[PDB]
Design a protein around this ligand. Sequence first.
Ligand code: NA
Length: 121
Amino acid sequence: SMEQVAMELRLTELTRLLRSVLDQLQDKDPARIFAQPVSLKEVPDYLDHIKHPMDFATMRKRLEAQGYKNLHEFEEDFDLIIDNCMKYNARDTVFYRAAVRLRDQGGVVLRQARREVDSIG
Ligand code: NA
């Protein structure tokens, strides 16, 4: 149907805007602390601590399969990145501090993205 195509054009355009959002979020992590999944070879206990791991490469794979139907879904995954790190790592660590900074800086980007998704529909 024609509706299904228009819908698909909206998903596709949302994917366009989310890709740009992702790239901007990833730039607030120049250290690349959040680029890849936590290695279970190097942190073998990780899944005892963290039930839903997340990282920017895993978000990107989902994005490119058009797996985010709305901004809310995308923000859930970004929040997992931050929130997982702030639980596993102590407050005095470079990891914890990197998550705080990402969250703060990410906030601005996400604030405007929400306006764009509402505005453009
Ligand atoms: Na903790």
